[PDB]
Symmetry: D5
Subunit: 155 residues, 10 copies
């Protein structure tokens, strides 16, 4: 599996993808139909953060009119990172950034209390987002971060 150490070719591909999606007024849910993969994984891949397996790349390529060069690039492992410079200003992204700023020390404390020394993985890891009704009217998003506990063992 090929990989890139710089982001500019994948950012160009992502821009080609987004302009086709907006021109055709598609949803990510619709683009993902037939990949057999979870919506969050494929969306992240279309946005430049994961490789797609070849079959999923060709399924999404048919819906967005991508050429063979684009299909090849969609299968490459990218230089990951979706917030240029690390600190977002967009309010939607910032709220998730803010959760980590405020609750980061609590997450560390409770991980070590309940699991032990080590980390919760961001690689052996699954993300998903669910819309649920709010009991007081309106809607809520339940974002689930599901990661393997990897212990730190004295050697």
């Amino acid at each position: 599996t090929q990989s890139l150490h710089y982001s500019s070719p994948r950012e160009t591909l992502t821009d080609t993808i987004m302009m086709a999606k907006i021109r055709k007024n598609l949803t990510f849910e619709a683009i993902n139909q037939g990949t057999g993969l979870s919506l969050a994984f494929v969306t992240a891949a279309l946005l430049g953060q994961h490789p797609l397996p070849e079959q999923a790349a060709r399924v999404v390529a048919e819906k967005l009119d991508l050429d063979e060069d684009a299909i090849r690039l969609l299968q490459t492992i990218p230089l990951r990172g979706s917030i240029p410079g690390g600190v977002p200003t967009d309010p939607t992204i910032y709220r998730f950034y803010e959760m980590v700023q405020i609750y980061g020390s609590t997450l560390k404390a409770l991980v070590h209390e309940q699991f032990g020394d080590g980390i919760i993985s961001a690689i052996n890891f699954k993300l998903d987002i669910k819309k649920v009704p709010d009991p007081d009217g309106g809607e809520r998003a339940v974002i689930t971060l599901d990661g393997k506990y990897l212990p730190t063992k004295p050697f």
Copy 2:
């Protein structure tokens, strides 16, 4: 309810709290017994990120030998933020920071697709962490971020 615009008095209190917890070899779960509040909220408060109601402040104060000045400070709204300088280096905290760096644009995209313009709140918001078994051996942490959808409406 009183508030502070600078963090040094609360950091001093947090250090008093942690040295009592380590000296007495207590868990956060044990300190929280009798508050009637969720473990994640009270842990964040002990770590300097929330005010406690007076009853919860006095319950935890009895377990950690805190004086009346400390009880008063525990009830104040703090200057929040738990990662000095915004960018963590500790690997445990960093993994949560990393999730937002990689999946931030995906979260934005799927929020706007499934909810619309606006944000998922970090204020009308609940966090919790659950330990569950991994089907392949080991354990996993399921962290749930549960926030109200607040729309952006043209005016």
Copy 3:
């Protein structure tokens, strides 16, 4: 409703809008006539910070000679943020930045005193600017920031 996680396409559209506005010597007030929306909101959208509803987008597009791709892009939710790098050097923008630097702790202190724990929203939010005469000669700007109070409650 479509959205973008990166700013380059909306920055290009904004430049197209600004060069047409300058070539035609139009005002924002004149562009805004007949949009059904407030001048501050539509101006922010033209400058790349909000989506416009379809009919308002078509009204401004006719005055500025924009095509159907530009009309679609005007309706997309953007990656928000109008000050590259966060810190402005332009004196006009800097004064508003400076108001927050100097009065930020005062705002926090009085929000908590008069409302309680939590925030004043920048999303459930309206801005407007009004010109008033100064009694000592000259003119003043009255800028109104009108945000919903969102409480932080123990959970």
Copy 4:
């Protein structure tokens, strides 16, 4: 009128003031009674961002048990700035920071359109915060920024 070019002595006085306010469970509104000055100005002065005139300094000192060294220091012009490092992490302050990040270019645009070249002053300037009911239940903060227009004229 004396002044300081560094913040540490004034930060010590602000800490002494906040610890007294919290000990006595006072409000800024109650501390301000009898100064004849606006709540936002006097609050900012107590938080280290303005000098107070002598009579106002003596009124607030009597409620906070300040001594003569502290009364003299409260009358000094400080090195202003209330957000260490410029970028806030506290959510309450951040929302006002975010307002400028999002609408900064819009404010510039409308200032130049409605007033002309130049700035809206942050010095010939008045700030106030008002609480009002939201018609849908809850409350809103109406923050007014009232600044003189100073034009940039070719010489």
Copy 5:
């Protein structure tokens, strides 16, 4: 008068201006003949930091062979700031930056002693530079900064 909230179109114009000036081997003094404006103001405008009024723009446009689009853009209020990133490395610019680094606290102290609380304006402001002989051989530059004092008064 029109304005821009981003610098790229004006940077392009400034480049066109400088390339014609170097190609024609002109001085700013000669370009400024007949504008009715001072050399420092017009030089700053040509370098992208001020608008020119229409007739002065046409006077400089004739000497530099600029088109009507360029003339219109010369009349726009720019996004101001002449040092990318804020910190200069060029020795000539750095010396003026260094004067403020070293004497900044002295300037604050003496402004407050001789004028009072408030600022010396950078907008109600005139700059000029004169060359005078040095009595011990050589030449000196006398740069004069002439700014209005704007008091900070209790409100």
Copy 6:
């Protein structure tokens, strides 16, 4: 003449000086009477930016009740720089910082046009502040930066 490569000793001495100046209600002009040196030079020295000759160090020491250790430290060449971090937030200091941000490229252009390649010195340099009335009411500061021209010649 002794020198220091770190600022903390002169920062402590500057604090000693300012606490005495405020306690005694002195002006810098009064402290400087009898040094035979310029107010701006001696003020900068008291604020940690220059050494004083012994005679001048003893004159200011008598006014401020400084001891022989402080007199020796006043004669030491300091590590210069009066704005921690380089970027000021205090409005009074920032205005002078802004003057360089806005007019830095103009200063460069006109130095090279009127003097040649090289720099205007900040070392062979004199600073002075004058207060003059403004015709429209109020007052203006005329700040004079007078520096040697030092050419850059090929080698």
Copy 7:
């Protein structure tokens, strides 16, 4: 097992350890005798980057005269990170920093080629340093970084 979200207490302990090591002229190899653990791990723990098991903590505490509070702190999981601000200036540390700056893209490229998508762990990880003779005279250091491959798999 206890943990800390801030580094100040472990930095204090590390200083106590280092002053005893220097006063007693001990080596890390001698302190490590009888801990049952590897020299690199125990050295990192003494320098504030790992917890020690209780018995190993007592072994090193006896050699360095540490008390029971220090022994408890040695067993706490710390806030990890050994380079304040991320970027070292010390030449010895900088060379290892430089290896990553220069070869980072090569490491990523060869990890993906030889293992696949994912990471080489810094937690399931062992470090050791060995001294070997250089054939051309002198000595070399062979530093071994031994990390588990953690794949990124489509989900």
Copy 8:
């Protein structure tokens, strides 16, 4: 041997190289066959961090369809550095960055203990990566950093 002090021409060549490698679905191991040099060195050179000797440049050029301009550029000494801005966000590179962040002080300590004052070279230096089975299933990467010891000797 020619060299460049800026990276953009070499970044263009690296892009041409990566697009060819991806188009032809080649491995670095396959590209390196016939150079007689180590895989890590040649990979780094292809990624823009080393010059290649002429014969090695011609061997890799033939597999990637490089022309004579590109062969000459591959032989030039580049401006080295593979992480724009110094701080990586890509998780694969970050783990190696994190190794230095955590163990940097330990490496310094053990270098000085086992070798003496001075540095472990990053120039007289060899890097290699080896894949080995993990006894518990899966695989590990053994990365060897092999650097000359250069002492700091008092002169």
Copy 9:
């Protein structure tokens, strides 16, 4: 003599120069033959850091196939600075950067001890590089920094 306040025109010219130098396989010493100027001065000019006198500009232009526009640009005083962002990552440049980081306070201390208050000039300044054999085998660079002492005198 003309001057520029932005670097992009000389960066383009420097690229033109280096592509010709590499294509032609020239040395800087060969390019400089016949200018009557020092290799370090002319090399810095070619790399965008000085203007050349006309005679020298035409000598280098003939060797490099530069046209009359490039000759005019070579005579222009540039915006100086050769390390984007100030901090180099290239090992060759970094070593000189490191020399100042390590010995900066020593240079200050010894300048003030041996010369007095003031600076060693980087403007009235000459740089040169010599290669000499090392007694132990290999080679050494002797770099000479020769600058005017400029005293700081009270005013």
Copy 10:
């Protein structure tokens, strides 16, 4: 020889050294008599950038009245770096920083032309400063940087 990975204890020692040197009015030249070492090396060590061998430490300790704890700490290898934050503001240090900013690319270019690929060492390295008369009046400093060339060779 012992070493430290943090700078605070050595900064404290350096302060003790400088206060005794200023109190006794000594020169570094006089302190260095009888050490057997060069003035630049010993000055750097006193300023916290090098260890001294034991007998030289005792020689300087006698002249500055340092204790046995101080003598031991003078012998430790420090965490090196003499400019907090990397960027100096002091004019005397800044001039040497500026020499590297301006001539850094020229130094790289000429090192590669005259030596080859690799670096000029900052560790196998000697620095000295000499005062020489200027033929046009005044004095100059000749600073010599003498570093070993370390080649970068293919492996």
